[PDB]
Design a protein around this ligand. Structure first.
Ligand code: CLA
Ligand code: CLA
Ligand code: CLA
Ligand code: CLA
Ligand code: CLA
Ligand code: CLA
Ligand code: CLA
Ligand SMILES: CC(/C=C/C=C(C)/C=C/[C@@]12O[C@]1(C)C[C@@H](O)CC2(C)C)=C\C=C\C=C(C)\C=C\C=C(C)\C=C\[C@@]12O[C@]1(C)C[C@@H](O)CC2(C)C
Ligand SMILES: CC(/C=C/C=C(C)/C=C/[C@@]12O[C@]1(C)C[C@@H](O)CC2(C)C)=C\C=C\C=C(C)\C=C\C=C(C)\C=C\[C@@]12O[C@]1(C)C[C@@H](O)CC2(C)C
Ligand SMILES: CC(/C=C/C=C(C)/C=C/[C@@]12O[C@]1(C)C[C@@H](O)CC2(C)C)=C\C=C\C=C(C)\C=C\C=C(C)\C=C\[C@@]12O[C@]1(C)C[C@@H](O)CC2(C)C
Ligand SMILES: CC1=C(/C=C/C(C)=C/C=C/C(C)=C\C=C\C=C(C)\C=C\C=C(C)\C=C\C2=C(C)CCCC2(C)C)C(C)(C)CCC1
Lengths: 41, 74, 193, 164, 74, 215, 194
């Protein structure tokens, strides 16, 4: 599956994994920390 | 637009125009309280023109019904 | 050379060692070109002379008790009756304004556009000090150092009066009074927090 | 009150708008059974709403005549009056991540230029090299100023022009 | 034509800052401003188009004509 | 070479002879911060001074802290000694910080110029005869001269021992100050008070009984 | 040489043995370069001179009973009327401050930047002691010794008044009175715990 891992390392597959990662990071943040308009403490 | 759509107007980015309200208050608009040059009654640019050209200009800016330095927001 | 102004740093190449007042201080490469540097050397000395006269005029008024340097041109508004050594001056603003406009240009424009001279021998040395034999650069260096200190003193007068509203001796007595509460931090201007 | 403004914990248009939103949610809630699944989500929306108003009034945001929080985007009016978390703290919390991505992509380009053919590792990204540059790019402003002090951040006039 | 005054051929090619500031500065412009009409038309249109925005910005805030700014459509 | 992880490939710029002969090199740079040799030369100075100021600060916290909890001093908490000692003070804090930044900036800019060029402050005519003892040693970060009164550098044996003792006590004190700040934020007590609270009930009073390891 | 300051320890190479007051004491290598040693051999003697005059002035006030060295510049605040041998001085602060700024600079600048001399023969020896034949170094050694002891004495004056608030004789009498309860440890300053 070395060719399958080179397919997993192509541009749109990395794009759709990394954008789901950076989407579902910010989404879990806005679940556990609702409505951040201002930098609080 | 997304905040107005979700019924939450308070989450808007409403950046106050600080840099131009400071220019209005330096021209004599006492609505914002920056009291810098002409809206401050104690400064020198205020004091050295009270007979020359200032009081009509100050009574014309602080009128909120002309277009002379309209009050401004986000 | 006689000084390094930040020791261990290299001297910039566009400053000659024989130039009076030298340390190598040019962190902006501001006098790199020789035609600009010659006019800067010709203007630094004259800023120094006029600031030595300015600091002497700003200090002798308070040391002789005649107000300060600030309130001395304050008779032009709200009254008049200028003084000098107590002697009254019956002149208004516009007459001495035009006299400073006319009588000073007959010395300034006669000095400036008649060359580029900065140490003219002859009538400006009546007693005789700068014969350019052995003690030219020494007295030139002393003149540069005293003039730079006077320029710093006059900008200190400007910022000191713009921050405290007081004169030179009128706050030097307070810094000698309260040496930890009468400095540039206890006002709410110079240090904003 | 910096520029004609008011604290949101002081203004009454802010509290009136909170009561307006809670009134809409309440008249929306009045249709359902008190323990059903829509009513739980509506009360959770009310709880998030009230927590949002409490934490906007707590941080000292400035309301206007409209009753809406404002952002003072000037240091010296945010640092002096305690509004640095509005703009002045996230204007570096952004730029760390911006220069982070701009440094990681820069180093991924420069570390793939000197190969057999670079373009194949731009459509097919070398993932161990990418994750190595992802982790070791954490100190990017440090490395950026150390690269600027060389002159290895810029390139000289070896660049490509047309006809000056 | 009277001996006193200033000349356009001398002011341009002497305002050159040294040490690589503006390069050779303003040396050679009078051969190209005077000979080109599209350069003159470009500077003229830039000036007229800016002071036309100036006319527009200053005729609403400072209305110069009697019973203007009551006629809103005007 | 006694690495921080025994099975890791040490970064190759920490295995150069310039970097292996450096104080406290345990092969630890997992984020590649010192890959340029002059970046490492700058950060070695930054580590020495972040660790010496931390050793002085952590000594000034826990030596009077342990001499407060055992009596015969009444030094307050380190997060309270700014609130107090400004009343028992000839000056307010602003003038004191201004004098502090002048007296410390005169030192720190000389150190800046010696790091950017070694032996800079030793050129003659700088001070009034004092500049001759300001070249430092052959390596930067360890000046000596007036800063070695007891004379522990005139050995050339056990010198890497003294280097590594300084670096390890300093890294431990930097972790101790990051501690002091964090164990203040977490529970609001003092550091020796937190040590007593751990020593009276270790298996229940720790950083798993507050809101900072939250699931 | 004439002394080793810590026996068994070696003398440094940069201290000349014919130099007056030599012991080898330089644990910082602080005068290693010869130009710095030449500046410091001049400045140590002048610190010793002015400290011998300072300790003589600080002791003669109390041995003659006119207050101490500390309160002798205390008339400039809270009154005036300075004394000397009981004779009044009708001078305010600023006049004598300017006279000390001017009249001392006309001798200090005449001394200093006119060379680097530290033992000028001629007018400064009216009786005649240093003909530089045989008894030069012995008298220079006695001057250095007495001056170093005077510098130690004046630093002891400063620390003693900063710790006890008294004069030199005013606590030398207490050390002679209670020798075991009036030393540098019974105050709560110099020894912090015991
Ligand atoms: C450039 C324009 C702009 C700006 C400045 C903002 C600004 C903001 N928007 Mg907005 N928005 C915009 C455009 C913009 N938006 C557009 C175009 C849309 C329509 C798509 C929206 C739709 C929108 C919605 C629907 C919402 C916002 C929200 C917000 C707020 C952000 C809260 C948040 O998520 O915190 C994020 C805070 C962080 C600290 C994230 C940083 C990430 C981590 C913590 C740092 C990294 C740590 C670690 C190293 C990562 C691990 C790496 C991993 C590999 C292990 C903020 C006021 C939210 C809000 O509350 O409104 C006020 C909200 O609900 N916006
Ligand atoms: C305006 C008058 C005047 C002038 C022009 C001079 C000029 C000079 N004096 Mg002089 N002096 C004067 C008044 C003056 N003095 C008076 C009134 C006294 C008696 C109090 C002395 C006592 C004196 C001594 C004892 C010595 C000189 C020396 C010198 C020369 C060295 C120049 C120098 O380094 O500046 C000095 C500039 C300063 C800003 C001085 C700094 C403050 C000093 C270090 C005192 C601080 C003490 C402090 C507790 C120690 C430092 C902290 C420590 C605990 C870590 C120079 C020719 C020295 C010399 O000839 O060297 C070979 C020398 O040994 N003078
Ligand atoms: C405005 C007066 C003025 C002028 C024309 C100069 C001119 C010069 N100075 Mg000088 N200097 C001045 C004031 C001035 N100085 C003051 C007040 C000080 C004391 C702080 C010094 C201290 C000083 C040192 C220590 C040295 C010089 C040197 C020089 C020469 C080369 C550096 C250069 O290009 O500066 C050109 C500078 C200007 C044209 C002035 C521009 C001022 C800018 C625009 C704003 C500065 C604002 C200020 C920082 C805050 C107020 C040049 C002849 C070097 C030299 O060899 O001496 C001859 C040198 O080593 N200067
Ligand atoms: C009238 C008048 C005229 C024609 C000039 C003309 C000139 N001045 Mg001058 N000057 C004037 C009034 C005038 N000044 C007054 C009233 C003052 C005192 C405030 C000065 C203070 C002054 C200084 C301090 C300097 C000049 C300099 C210059 C020259 C640039 C130029 C020759 C500068 C110069 O020659 O150096 C380039 C310079 O350094 N002037
Ligand atoms: C676009 C540029 C700009 C403008 C128009 C202003 C405008 C103003 N600043 Mg400001 N400022 C700016 C950029 C700017 N700032 C930047 C980049 C900084 C540094 C981060 C500061 C730091 C600053 C401070 C520290 C202070 C101001 C103050 C002021 C006010 C006078 C005025 C509202 C002052 C103020 O509060 O008003 C009196 C004040 O104390 N500013
Ligand atoms: C470095 C450093 C650090 C980490 C702190 C940390 C702290 N200081 Mg502090 N401080 C510092 C340097 C530092 N200070 C310096 C250099 C000065 C001298 C100007 C002060 C003067 C100072 C005062 C005067 C006060 C603090 C206070 C505080 C505490 C409130 C936050 C906090 C523990 C406050 C405090 O302890 O009150 C609870 C307080 O009142 N600090
Ligand atoms: C500030 C006064 C001063 C100065 C300039 C000197 C200068 C000198 N001493 Mg000397 N000394 C002094 C005070 C001073 N001493 C005092 C008070 C004592 C008695 C404790 C001695 C006892 C002494 C001995 C026994 C010997 C010297 C020697 C020397 C010479 C070489 C050492 C050197 O480089 O010192 C340079 C010194 C300085 C630059 C002074 C620095 C002071 C620092 C910054 C603070 C000191 C803090 C202090 C411990 C407590 C306050 C040099 C000429 C040797 C020699 O050959 O005699 C000529 C020698 O063997 N000294
Ligand atoms: C301070 C000053 C210049 C400062 C400039 C500096 C330091 C520049 C330094 C640098 O450029 C270099 C060197 C190198 C560059 O690479 C870097 C920088 C750092 C940029 C000029 C003052 C110059 C100041 C002058 C000439 C002042 C003259 C004062 C007068 C005449 C006063 C007159 C009066 O006081 C009386 C007599 C009586 C009163 O009653 C009436 C009045 C009028 C108030
Ligand atoms: C300087 C310091 C503290 C100094 C404290 C002082 C002066 C305190 C003074 C006071 O207390 C007193 C005396 C009395 C009080 O009343 C007043 C104050 C003022 C409070 C702490 C440093 C503390 C510094 C710390 C904790 C630094 C930690 C850095 C780490 C761990 C980085 C590791 C890495 O960078 C490497 C090495 C390699 C990369 O590849 C990987 C990563 C992981 C990025
Ligand atoms: C102590 C002292 C110097 C101490 C320095 C020492 C030990 C340095 C030693 C070292 O450097 C060496 C040698 C070698 C280095 O490798 C190591 C160290 C160890 C670092 C100088 C005091 C020097 C002290 C001096 C010069 C004091 C002069 C006092 C005067 C003039 C007093 C006048 C008055 O008392 C009267 C007369 C009447 C009053 O009413 C008014 C006043 C004004 C108070
Ligand atoms: C404070 C503040 C402000 C202000 C600001 C300002 C005013 C600024 C300025 C600025 C400036 C004046 C700038 C300039 C610049 C220039 C340049 C020239 C730059 C450059 C840059 C670069 C070059 C970068 C690069 C890089 C890096 C390093 C990282 C990433 C990657 C790259 C490569 C891209 C405001 C209020 C608004 C807001 C808040 C904050």
């Amino acid at each position: 599956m070395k060719d399958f891992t080179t397919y997993l390392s192509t541009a749109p597959v990395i794009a759709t994994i990394w954008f789901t990662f950076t989407a579902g990071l910010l989404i879990e943040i806005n679940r556990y920390f609702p409505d951040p308009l201002v930098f609080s403490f | 637009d997304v905040m107005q759509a979700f019924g939450t107007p308070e989450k808007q980015i409403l950046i106050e125009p600080v840099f131009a309200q400071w220019i209005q208050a330096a021209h004599g608009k006492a609505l914002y309280g920056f009291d810098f040059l002409l809206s401050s009654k104690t400064s020198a640019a205020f004091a050295n023109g009270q007979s020359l050209w200032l009081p009509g200009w100050l009574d014309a800016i602080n009128n909120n019904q002309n277009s002379l330095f309209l009050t401004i927001g986000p | 050379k006689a000084g390094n102004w930040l020791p261990g740093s290299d001297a910039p190449a566009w400053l000659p060692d024989d130039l009076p007042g030298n340390y190598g201080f040019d962190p902006l490469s501001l006098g790199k070109e020789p035609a600009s540097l010659k006019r800067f050397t010709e203007s630094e000395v004259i800023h120094g002379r006029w600031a030595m006269l300015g600091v002497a005029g700003s200090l002798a008024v308070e040391l002789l008790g005649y107000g300060n340097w600030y309130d001395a041109p304050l008779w032009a508004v709200n009254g008049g009756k200028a003084t000098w050594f107590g002697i009254e001056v019956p002149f208004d603003l516009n007459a001495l304004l035009a006299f400073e406009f006319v009588a000073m240009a007959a010395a300034e424009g006669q000095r400036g556009d008649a060359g580029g001279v900065v140490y003219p021998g002859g009538a400006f040395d009546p007693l005789g000090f700068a014969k350019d034999s052995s003690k030219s650069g020494e007295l030139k260096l002393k003149e540069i150092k005293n003039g730079r200190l006077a320029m710093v003193a006059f900008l200190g007068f400007v910022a000191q009066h713009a921050a405290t509203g007081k004169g030179p001796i009128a706050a030097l007595g307070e810094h000698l009074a309260n040496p930890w509460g009468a400095n540039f931090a206890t006002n709410g201007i110079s240090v904003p927090f | 009150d910096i520029a004609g403004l008011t604290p949101c914990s002081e203004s009454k248009a802010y509290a009136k708008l909170e009561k307006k939103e809670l009134k809409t949610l309440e008249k929306r809630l009045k249709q359902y059974e008190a323990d059903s699944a829509p009513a739980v989500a509506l009360k959770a929306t009310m709880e998030r709403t009230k927590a949002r108003f409490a934490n906007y009034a707590k941080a000292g945001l400035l309301c206007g005549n409209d009753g809406l929080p404002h952002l003072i985007a000037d240091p010296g009016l945010a640092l002096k009056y305690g509004h640095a978390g509005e703009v002045f703290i996230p204007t570096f919390g952004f730029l760390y991540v911006a220069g982070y991505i701009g440094y990681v992509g820069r180093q991924y380009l420069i570390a793939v230029k000197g190969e057999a053919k670079p373009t194949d590792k731009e459509i097919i990204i070398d993932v161990p090299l990418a994750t190595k540059l992802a982790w070791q790019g954490a100190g990017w402003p440090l490395a950026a100023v150390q690269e600027l002090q060389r002159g290895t951040l810029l390139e000289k006039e070896e660049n490509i022009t047309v006809s000056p | 034509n009277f001996g006193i005054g200033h000349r356009m051929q001398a002011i341009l090619e002497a305002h050159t800052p040294p040490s690589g500031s503006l390069g050779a500065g303003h040396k050679g412009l009078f051969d190209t401003v005077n000979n080109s009409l599209h350069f003159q038309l470009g500077l003229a249109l830039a000036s007229v188009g800016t002071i036309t925005s100036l006319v527009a910005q200053h005729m609403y805030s400072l209305p110069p004509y009697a019973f203007q700014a009551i006629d809103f459509t005007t | 070479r006694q690495s921080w992880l025994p099975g890791s490939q040490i970064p190759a710029h920490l295995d150069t002879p310039a970097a292996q002969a450096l104080a406290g090199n345990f092969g630890f740079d997992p984020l590649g911060l010192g890959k340029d040799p002059v970046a490492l030369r700058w950060y070695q100075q930054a580590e020495l001074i972040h660790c010496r100021t931390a050793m002085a600060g952590v000594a000034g916290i826990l030596i009077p802290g342990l001499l407060t909890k055992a009596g015969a001093l009444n030094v307050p908490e380190w997060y309270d000694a700014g609130k107090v000692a400004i009343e028992n003070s000839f000056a307010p804090w602003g003038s004191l910080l201004a004098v502090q930044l002048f007296l410390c900036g005169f030192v720190e800019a000389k150190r800046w110029q010696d790091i950017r060029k070694p032996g800079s402050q030793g050129e003659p005519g700088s001070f009034l005869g004092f500049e001759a003892s300001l070249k430092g040693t052959s390596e930067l970060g360890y000046p000596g001269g007036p800063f070695d009164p007891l004379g522990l550098s005139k050995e050339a044996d056990k010198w890497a021992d003294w280097k590594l003792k300084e670096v390890k006590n300093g890294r431990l004190a930097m972790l101790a100050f990051l501690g002091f700040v964090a164990q203040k934020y977490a529970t609001g007590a003092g550091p020796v008070d937190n040590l007593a609270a751990h020593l009276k009930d270790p298996w229940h009073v720790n950083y798993a009984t507050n809101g900072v390891s939250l699931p």
